[PDB]
Amino acid sequence: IATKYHGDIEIHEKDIVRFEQGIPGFLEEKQFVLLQLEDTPFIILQSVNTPALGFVLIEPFSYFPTYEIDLDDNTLEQLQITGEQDVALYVILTVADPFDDTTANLQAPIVINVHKRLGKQVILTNTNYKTKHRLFPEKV
Amino acid sequence: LVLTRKLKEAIQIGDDIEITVLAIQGDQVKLGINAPKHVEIHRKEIYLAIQAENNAASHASKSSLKRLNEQL
Numbered sequence: 001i002a003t004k005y006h007g008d009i010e011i012h013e014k015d016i017v018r019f020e021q022g023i024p025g026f027l028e029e030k031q032f033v034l035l036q037l038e039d040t041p042f043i044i045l046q047s048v049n050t051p052a053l054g055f056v057l058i059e060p061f062s063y064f065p066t067y068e069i070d071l072d073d074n075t076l077e078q079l080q081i082t083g084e085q086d087v088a089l090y091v092i093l094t095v096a097d098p099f100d101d102t103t104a105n106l107q108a109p110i111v112i113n114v115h116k117r118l119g120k121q122v123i124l125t126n127t128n129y130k131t132k133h134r135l136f137p138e139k140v
Numbered sequence: 141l142v143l144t145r146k147l148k149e150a151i152q153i154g155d156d157i158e159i160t161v162l163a164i165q166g167d168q169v170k171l172g173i174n175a176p177k178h179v180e181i182h183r184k185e186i187y188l189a190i191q192a193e194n195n196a197a198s199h200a201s202k203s204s205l206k207r208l209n210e211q212l
Contacts, residue, residue, distance in 0.1 A: 005205075024187060024194055025195045026198075037205060040205065040209040042209070073177075074180065078177070092193070095204050099211055100211070105190070105193050105197070107190070131190060131192075131193045132193065
């Protein structure tokens with residue numbers, strides 16, 4: 001598969017995370033692989049079927065210690081999770097112009113279960129989380 | 141499709157989603173939506189916003205991330 005940031009790689013199918021619903025705005029994008037960008041904290045949610053589609057993810061925790069999240073039992077089972085062991089949690093970055101207005105979408109994290117290879121963008125309901133949370137304090 | 145529903149009058153969508161008018165308040169309506177939970181329901185304004193930000197997030201250049209990593 002050609003990729004957005006990593007050049008041409010190929011992959012085995014147990015790498016592939018399925019997003020049955022795709023994600024809002026890209027509903028038919030139903031296959032992704034997760035690729036670290038060295039030497040960065042960025043995880044690239046890369047389309048197996050669209051080389052030019054790759055989202056920039058970060059583990060929420062490093063930059064928002066407080067970030068805690070409650071999975072509606074709906075979500076809990078379209079992902080089909082059995083407990084904690086599963087699962088992986090990320091936020092989508094909106095890298096802005098300029099860089100210091102970069103924001104993370106805390107209201108809609110990406111949730112994956114690394115064992116069954118199932119993915120979803122979870123719209124957190126009943127919460128004060130925004131769709132744009134700045135990484136950096138705004139100077140001046 | 142446009143329809144008119146009196147107070148406890150419901151609508152059937154596929155096999156099924158069912159919309160149940162549960163109250164008229166009267167600047168607002170208290171709808172009830174029954175669906176299987178492989179299907180999610182959201183306020184439209186919330187869903188659109190998240191669509192918007194997803195799209196906004198799909199344009200990060202490789203240069204941008206290098207600069208962003210540095211500053212991080």
